[PDB]
Design a protein around this nucleic acid. Structure first.
Ligand SMILES: [Mg+2]
Ligand SMILES: [Mg+2]
Ligand SMILES: [Mg+2]
Ligand SMILES: [Mg+2]
Ligand SMILES: [Mg+2]
Lengths: 95, 52, 107, 41, 95, 83, 49, 49
RNA sequence: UUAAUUUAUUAAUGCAAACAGUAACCUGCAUUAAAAAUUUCGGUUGGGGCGACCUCGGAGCAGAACCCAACCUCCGAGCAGUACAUGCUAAGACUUCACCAGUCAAAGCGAACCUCAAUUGAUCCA
């Protein structure tokens, strides 16, 4: 994904009006890319003990690739949704 | 041969004036009038500002 | 090749008998085609100007240079023993008197 | 505050100065002397 | 100078003039002398002084400027403490 | 200080108007005796043959301003007399 | 509906909070003092209102 | 100007002189577009008031 | 094209992004190439070309208030030196035939007790 700042300034047109645009408003200047960004980490609840990377029942911050192409498809983990979190807590308590 | 230089007053700070001096010789110190202070005061050379 | 310089527009700006106010330039020159006389000044160009309100007059007056100015002195020394140099001088002859006493009040 | 600070600085400078000027004068004199000496040689 | 604009069909102002000059209500045009913030070292003090003054434009120049602007820049403006306010109106003329 | 029933103010338009403020100096009880004496000594030029300290002022087009100026003058004089 | 008017923006606030220019947010204890001062300056007597 | 208005009947000094009243009288025409911020009282008829 | 500005196309690379593991194919940003693409080709001139010149100043033509040309005749300049009140301001003038640029300058307030012929360059931008 590319974020593209618009050079040349759209001249500001009303509440309920489209602002017509010019072939110089078509000129852009890319401010940032979503790529070339600090890689973030995703939260997952583990349904199974995995190696040293996760303890069963616990909520861990994983590398996103690992989450998306291994853990989630293989039923080894689930998203940090508030829904199932409660359930997991309950399970822990029971244990 | 000659350098342009800025000269900064010690008393009556903020007032700077531009003068000539030969490139080969000493950093310049000079008595000169500050219209802020309204008295003559020593200026000291600081930063050359083009050479010629 | 060479230079083609514009005309300099120098010369007399005010002639004898003209009414010339303080500040009016009287004559502009390079070198002294005229010299400053009574109530007439000299700018850095050698340009002559009126120092008071009045009338311009021209006169041929005996010229004595300043002692400190060397070249003139030398010239003077060179001249024979009954010679006097002479030069043209521009004067303003002032018209309106500087002062008039007026009655302010009876105290 | 701004007015005070700059003003204070200025005052300080003024206080300093009288002797600074003297020093400068002395330096100038010294320089002159040196020049004279050089000329003599 | 766009005697008729595209959308409104009104005359436009050449904004250069507006940037550079001050129209007094009497219709004098005041300008900063050119070459006044430049090469001030080589210039003699008198020259500097001359260059730091404002100046009134020639009649022809004034006329040109009037043509170049719209009637908005010629209106009476009652500013609180504009330093030029006293020069807008003219006193004691005679031909 | 300066109660205005003591003073004699007279106007004169001529744009610059003129406001003649005037009063008998020696008999003015509102001015102190030594102060009065001092005033007499100093501003004798302003005082009339009759014995009235006249100090007119002209500067503004409105007479009020002139009057104010005149008033201020008296105050200034008093101050001077004091020290 | 008839709206509520807004206050001085920023640099008009010191104007209208002083009683020497009869400001509508200025403290009315000082108004009389101001009046007195004015009277002292420009002659004439304050008519008691 | 104010004095004149008073004399002429328009602008009643028995009521308060608000901007609105003045406008009604048609002493002071003002225009919010072109950024007028109301009337300013001026010294021009200082005496003879 | 070995004139300028560009590389959006193709070119490989390089770094990201995607990837896998263990003790390639695609997108984004950089790179230098190839290929192209916009583009313009100043004036004076005894036709044009070639050669020379193109701004400023002094002298002659232009003999006596200014002004006055030529690819007419002759000199030069594109700086120095001294200061560091080459501080502030200000009546009144001159002006290179417009404008822009230049010049002179009484008084006043501050202080003491400029030389030089030419010696330079607007606006916007930095
Ligand atoms: Mg609308
Ligand atoms: Mg040609
Ligand atoms: Mg030929
Ligand atoms: Mg001319
Ligand atoms: Mg003087």
């Amino acid at each position: 994904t590319v974020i593209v700042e618009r050079w040349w300034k759209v001249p500001l047109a009303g509440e309920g009006r489209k602002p017509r645009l010019h072939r110089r408003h078509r000129v852009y200047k890319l401010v940032e890319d979503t790529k070339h960004r600090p890689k973030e980490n995703l939260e997952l609840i583990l349904t199974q003990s995995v190696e040293n990377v996760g303890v069963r029942g616990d909520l861990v911050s994983v590398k996103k690739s690992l989450g998306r192409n291994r853990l989630l498809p293989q039923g080894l983990a689930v998203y940090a949704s508030p829904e199932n979190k409660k359930l997991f807590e309950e399970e822990k308590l029971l244990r | 041969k000659n350098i342009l230089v800025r000269m900064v007053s010690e008393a009556g700070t903020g007032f700077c004036f531009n003068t000539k001096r030969n490139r080969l010789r000493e950093k310049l110190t000079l008595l000169h009038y500050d219209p802020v202070v309204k008295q003559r005061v020593l200026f000291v050379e600081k930063k050359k500002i083009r050479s010629l | 090749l060479g230079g083609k310089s514009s005309g300099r527009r120098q010369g007399i700006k005010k002639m004898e008998g003209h009414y010339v106010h303080a500040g009016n330039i009287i004559a502009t020159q390079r070198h002294f085609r005229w010299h400053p006389g009574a109530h007439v000044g000299v700018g850095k160009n050698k340009c002559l100007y009126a120092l008071e309100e009045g009338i311009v007059r021209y006169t041929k007056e005996v010229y004595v240079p300043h002692p400190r100015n060397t070249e003139a002195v030398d010239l003077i020394t060179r001249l024979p023993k009954g010679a006097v140099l002479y030069k043209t001088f521009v004067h303003v002859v002032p018209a309106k008197p500087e002062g008039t006493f007026k009655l302010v009040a009876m105290l | 505050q701004k007015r005070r600070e700059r003003e204070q600085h200025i005052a300080e400078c003024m206080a300093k100065m009288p002797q600074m000027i003297v020093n400068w004068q002395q330096q100038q004199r010294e320089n002159w002397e040196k020049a004279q000496a050089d000329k003599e040689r | 100078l766009t005697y008729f604009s595209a959308r409104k069909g009104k005359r436009k102002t050449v904004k250069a003039v507006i940037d550079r000059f001050l129209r007094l209500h009497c219709g004098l045009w005041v300008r900063r002398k050119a070459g006044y913030k430049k090469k001030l070292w080589k210039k003699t003090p008198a020259r500097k002084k001359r260059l730091r003054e404002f100046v009134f434009c020639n009649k022809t120049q004034s006329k040109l400027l009037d043509k170049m602007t719209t009637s908005f820049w010629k209106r009476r403006n009652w500013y609180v403490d504009d330093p030029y306010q006293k020069y807008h109106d003219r006193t004691n003329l005679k031909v | 200080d300066i109660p205005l029933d003591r003073l004699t103010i007279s106007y004169c338009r001529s744009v610059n108007s003129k406001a003649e403020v005037r009063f008998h100096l020696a008999t003015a009880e509102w001015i102190a005796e030594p102060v009065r004496q001092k005033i007499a000594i100093t501003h004798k030029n302003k005082i009339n043959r009759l014995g009235e300290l006249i100090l007119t002022s002209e500067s503004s087009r409105y007479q009020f301003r002139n009057l104010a100026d005149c008033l201020q003058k008296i105050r200034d004089m008093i101050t001077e007399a004091s020290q | 509906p008839i709206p509520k008017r807004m206050l001085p923006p920023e640099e008009l606030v010191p104007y209208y909070t002083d009683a020497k220019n009869r400001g509508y947010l200025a403290d009315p204890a000082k108004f009389p003092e101001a009046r007195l001062e004015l009277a002292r300056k420009y002659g004439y007597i304050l008519p008691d209102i | 100007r104010l004095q004149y208005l008073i004399d002429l009947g328009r602008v009643d000094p028995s009521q308060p002189i608000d901007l609105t009243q003045l406008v009604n009288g048609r002493g002071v025409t003002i225009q919010p577009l072109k950024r007028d911020y109301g009337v300013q009282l001026v010294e021009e008829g200082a005496d003879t008031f």
